[PDB]
A paper describes a structure:
VCCN1 was recently identified as a voltage-gated chloride channel residing in the thylakoid membrane, where it plays a key role in photoreaction tuning to avoid the generation of reactive oxygen species (ROS). VCCN1 structurally resembles its animal homolog, bestrophin, a Ca2+-gated anion channel. However, unlike bestrophin channels, VCCN1 lacks the Ca2+-binding motif but instead contains an N-terminal charged helix that is anchored to the lipid membrane through an additional amphipathic helix. MdVCCN1 forms a symmetric homopentamer, with each subunit consisting of three domains: transmembrane domain (TMD), N-terminal domain (NTD), and stromal domain (SMD).
We then performed single-particle cryo-EM analyses of MdVCCN1 in detergent micelles (glyco-diosgenin; GDN), and in nanodiscs to investigate the structure in a native-like membrane environment. The structures were determined at 3.0 Å and 2.7 Å, respectively, with imposed C5 symmetry. Notably, the NAH is only visualized in the nanodisc structure and is disordered in the detergent micelles, indicating that the lipid environment is essential to stabilize this helix.
Numbering used by the authors:
A (entry chain A), B (entry chain A), C (entry chain A), D (entry chain A), E (entry chain A): 84 to 419
The structure:
Amino acid sequence: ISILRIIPDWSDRTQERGMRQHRTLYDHEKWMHHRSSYRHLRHLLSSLSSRVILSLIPPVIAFTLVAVVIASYNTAVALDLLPGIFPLLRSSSLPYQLTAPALALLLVFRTEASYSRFEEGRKSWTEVIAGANDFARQIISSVETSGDAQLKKALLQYIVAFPVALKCHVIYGSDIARDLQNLLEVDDLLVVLNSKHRPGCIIQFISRSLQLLKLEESRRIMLQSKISCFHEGIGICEQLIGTPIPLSYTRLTSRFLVLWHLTLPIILWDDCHWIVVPATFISAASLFCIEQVGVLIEEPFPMLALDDLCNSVRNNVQEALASEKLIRARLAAKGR
Amino acid sequence: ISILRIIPDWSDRTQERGMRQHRTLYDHEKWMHHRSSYRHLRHLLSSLSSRVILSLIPPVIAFTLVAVVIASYNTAVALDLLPGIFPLLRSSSLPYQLTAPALALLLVFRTEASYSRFEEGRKSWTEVIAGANDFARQIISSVETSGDAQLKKALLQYIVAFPVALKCHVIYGSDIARDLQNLLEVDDLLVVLNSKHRPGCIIQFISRSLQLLKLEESRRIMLQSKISCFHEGIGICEQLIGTPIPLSYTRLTSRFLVLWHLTLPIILWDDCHWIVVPATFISAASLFCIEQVGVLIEEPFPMLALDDLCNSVRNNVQEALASEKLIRARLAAKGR
Amino acid sequence: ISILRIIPDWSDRTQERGMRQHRTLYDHEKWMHHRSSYRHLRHLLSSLSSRVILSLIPPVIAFTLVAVVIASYNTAVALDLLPGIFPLLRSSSLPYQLTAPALALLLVFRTEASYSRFEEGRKSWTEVIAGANDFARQIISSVETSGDAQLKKALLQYIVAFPVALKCHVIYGSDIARDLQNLLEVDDLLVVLNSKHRPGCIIQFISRSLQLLKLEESRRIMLQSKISCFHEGIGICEQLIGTPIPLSYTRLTSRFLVLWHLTLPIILWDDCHWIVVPATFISAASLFCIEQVGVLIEEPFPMLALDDLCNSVRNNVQEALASEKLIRARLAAKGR
Amino acid sequence: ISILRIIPDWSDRTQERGMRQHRTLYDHEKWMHHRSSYRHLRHLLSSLSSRVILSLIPPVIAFTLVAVVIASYNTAVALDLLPGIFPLLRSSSLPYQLTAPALALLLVFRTEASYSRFEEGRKSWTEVIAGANDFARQIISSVETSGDAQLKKALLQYIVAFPVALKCHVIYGSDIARDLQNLLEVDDLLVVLNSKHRPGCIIQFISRSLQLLKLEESRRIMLQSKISCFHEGIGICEQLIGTPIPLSYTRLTSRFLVLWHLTLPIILWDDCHWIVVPATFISAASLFCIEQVGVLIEEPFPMLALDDLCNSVRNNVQEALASEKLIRARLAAKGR
Amino acid sequence: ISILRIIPDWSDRTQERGMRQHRTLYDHEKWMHHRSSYRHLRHLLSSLSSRVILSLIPPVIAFTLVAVVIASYNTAVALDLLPGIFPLLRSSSLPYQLTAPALALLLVFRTEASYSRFEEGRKSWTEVIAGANDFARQIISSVETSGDAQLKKALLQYIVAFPVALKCHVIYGSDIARDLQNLLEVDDLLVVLNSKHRPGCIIQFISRSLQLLKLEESRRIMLQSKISCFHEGIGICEQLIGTPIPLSYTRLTSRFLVLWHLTLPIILWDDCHWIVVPATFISAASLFCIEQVGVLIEEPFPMLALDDLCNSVRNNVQEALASEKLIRARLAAKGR
């Protein structure tokens, strides 16, 4: 049997297969294609290849089968085939015209709640990447002692490694031992691997490196006040992945949807007979789609493009280390 | 009599029994189950085991009984059994089709107001746990004097004890003497027990420990500027548990709901006769459910999973104290 | 005449009498009663004792009298009593079915605007009370010189007096000379009384006390950076009480309501005859109630429970001063 | 001709005449009058004296004339006066019953967008006035040297002058040479007058005054960190007056309104004949009014009462300078 | 063929041609014209010259052609021209009257999501320009050594160059080598040109200039704490241009729109015959317009007027450098 727990398992397999897809940062050409006139034709032709439509098949099939049974029973009562003790399963649409606004508002507000979490995650990552950039810039400008060349090089290696370590902590199946192969030294990477909380371990490396630096006390206090950003980022990411939206607030939306779609063929039979099947199909493909988008967007980190966000910090620190000698030579030639 | 103050007392007993339920942080597998295709069937089969549906029985029963009396009186006036001086209790639906949007918007906005408080509580806890982590990291990195080993150990014990003490202050029936058994020393725990404001007492311990530390004045000022986070967290939690949403804003929603559900059988009699009973049942189970979710989510701390949030800080400080010697040995071998 | 400026004056007298009502912080038992099943019956039986319903009588009576005149004129044109030159005052409901959403959205958005101001006031007070707590804690921990015992005692007296002084500034009829009797000394209270801006005067006392303290310059700069919170709190409270929501944004809502309720009997006459009186009554009691809640919640400080918020700071500083000797004795016994 | 560019010019003249109206801060009595029962009668009787209703005449007259032409043509086709080749200009209301929600939501959301800008401006001013108060308080408490009496007096004169200078920069026709007559000295005011950016010039005065003050370096750094508030305030005000809401987002609302009101008589003719004129009148007076309120509130500074906000800072600094000797004498008598 | 990929390519060419349009800051006269009575006539006459209407032709033409085919087939089935096996393609409007609210809310919420990004971009730029102003003011006031005249002049040149460099990074086709011709020296501009991340390079110049300045350590730490604003601004701009709104959240809106507009002639045929063509035209020109505005506003930087925002900082630093001697001479004459 196709409906006997086969469609829902295939839907889940495909949905989890689509979660681990490579994302890239938008540049200007992608934005041109996004704003283009062909966008509507594109989105149409891209369905049956998207997570949201492929994960929507079970509900829509279930609610179309119910409408076919309602229709085939009301059609059996008329032009009667069965004993006259069975009534027509029909009703008035007036009760559901006074409640449609409530269901519409509840679905749209739940989707907005989910988008809020998406935005929170994006901002948290924005502040982490900005802070890693600013800390690395300050370390390059501040650390000047010839005797602390070795520790500075290590100190800039642990900053670039922090966004990667945090990205491996919030993404289900990633290998931190492969992403940090070329960043950390062989002996420092084993200390990170033995730790249960890898980003916490890299923070401890950075904090201990800043103590052994022969800086003035004022400058050391200034430098070590930038670590608080990494703590805040770790916190926000852990809470966004640990603490979902209220389950009451979500089961409400689910229960209301199922009840509305079960009795919708009964209120619509009186005016459109046998047209309730496509009406139920369209209602189930629209209202359930709105809920599904919100469910997918809610743990936000699988759809954020963190690899290019980490690569940006890596590239920026490499560029800043390469451009040091030219800038120092240009600023040395001021009045001489 | 089942309706004579029996259902509302059983509903309250069950509702308060469900408030004190153990919550856990979501990991990745829980998120897989949450996003799955079987979610709708699950939420259906989980009803009659949830707070929101079990606390919804009194209103829905009350408003279905009213509809049965309206119906059984209108049915008595037709095919008359009674003197002809009694009129039919019927009306037009047109007045309620111009006001449905207002009730829908008012209910959904009240629920969003409640979710705002839920989010405020979650963020407050996020900042408290992040700050406890950051303070503990800085104390481990900064305190280096051999003569202050004893006070440092105590200083890290009062940081881990702060989130627990704050969690026992915002949760109705918890024993702080059992949660802090293995964290604080026997003599320091009695000073916390005799205090009316336990988190305030632990803050006073931390502040006094930071004065007796033989630190430089700049470093002491840097360290003691991290205590402000704990004050802010205490404040926000106390205000969220002390100051609810305006009672005007809540009694409005309640009064409007009761009035709409009392007269709903009268406006719906003219088109659906005797179908007003199930219509009233569905309207009362949907509109009252939306309000109930909002009432439950509004004091937010019973549904936040604070035990795993405190355990995280405990584990992190233990891991950081265990990994100190390896990190110091690795950073010592830079140029030697 | 009852309607000749008698009902509106009694309504105003009662409304202003209900503004000055004692509020208490919610504890856990109050929250139990709030979430209970009996809440709906309670809110019903509590009407005719609430500000919002007693201040709603004039509009609802005015709009019910209009409907009675419309009805008694349409009933006079039919079964004619009058010359045939007078037409029936009836219309179509179709124009008002395309505009109902706009009025619903405008009323609900105005109420949300008002709740935003309520939340702003609550947060402002949260930050003021948290800052007073944190400043007092730091003064207790930092000030250690035996020669500055007298000034420290005064310095902690002006912190506790600040929330009270600010509460008397934002509450219409309060006596600051009675609330500060037991807090300030007899000579310092006369300097506060002669000032036009009392919270500003207490801030000047705190700032001058921090200069005469024989502290190190770093520690004095740290201590006097906490006064900025009190300035910010004063600012926000003054702006919330001085600058209301745009009068355009409010007169719009009022004008739209009055116009909709004047012509509502004319559009509803064609389907429900003489049932327009109760329909007008219900519409005026619902739509006007939504607006009234928003008007009451808008200057937010009369409904915030500031006395218990100030008493909290008083109690906390007393408890911290009493627990000093035990904490110092416990921390002295670390390695000796 | 009254309609030939006469009504729109008179409307603009009156609208710009009403922009430059004196505003005062609300005290408690004004709040009593605002919350009163007579408010609805007041707002009614105040129309034909308000900006929003007087600037609404052109659109409402234009759309009522269109409805009169539609009606007088449909009435000419019936009881025919003209050749039978002209059809009746009638339609079905069903298309506009599925789109009314969209127009309602778009208008209300645009008005909320405008109120957001109003709130941004109010908060920006709140932070500027609070910061000017806090800077002035700190300068009074900190500057103690007898040799810097002359510069301190000037330093407090430039703080009070800053809110006035910023208010003259964001208000169209104000004279800064008259508002600063009694605040600045005759020679310092000419340097401000010759500058293109007056608030920027006063900031440069304050910054240069803080360098010539014989303060300790820590205290000078603390004092000059308060200037950043004035920069932030200048920025926010300039951006709010320079960068309006997207013109796409505004022309959409305008175009949709004009199209809906042009064809509204055609869809409403089929049920109400000749009643489309008042229906069009009411729709144009309600929907256009909602848009107009939003247009007026959008550059927010003409309706904020900045003169009383500046006068507050002036009064507070005068009061603090007058109360210095009493506070110093009271604090001197602590143990002596 | 006009419809064979000709209209969509011309629409895209025109749309991208309109993206690169010069924007200016609003002054007071522009605000007068914006609030004027003639605004509605203006917006009407300005269509067929706007991006949003010219990019709306393909969808509206496509959905009007569908309605013409539906109409010309239903008209062929009636007054039959074809074999009687073909049914009438008609339906009931009742299913779409219960779903209209959902589509309205989804479109308006997506447009609000886009406006949120517009506001984020505006605020980010506000903070960058304010910070550049404040840093430049502090450098002018602080740097006093005669031997560091040459480096100060350069230091003020790199601050003014930062907003320009950031503007060339977020705007598709701009020449940074032409915008910085008169700002930077010939040798310093080549170091900026060779860099992949130009704003990052200018930040490295500023940081290295602040190290070679013979300042006190406290003052150097104060000055170099202002660079963090430029990092935060770079971050926010890069994330706003790299990370768009969820594609699920956007393809949902597109798919729902296309499905609603394809079947709209079928539900509207039963009451308005052949009037479905203009109804489809109006629905497609309104609902698609709302979506298009949101798509255009979403990457926010092409419609922000950044050239006048950079020119403001340039002018302000020139004015502050010119007014230094007058202010110093005025403040020198205090007691002498």
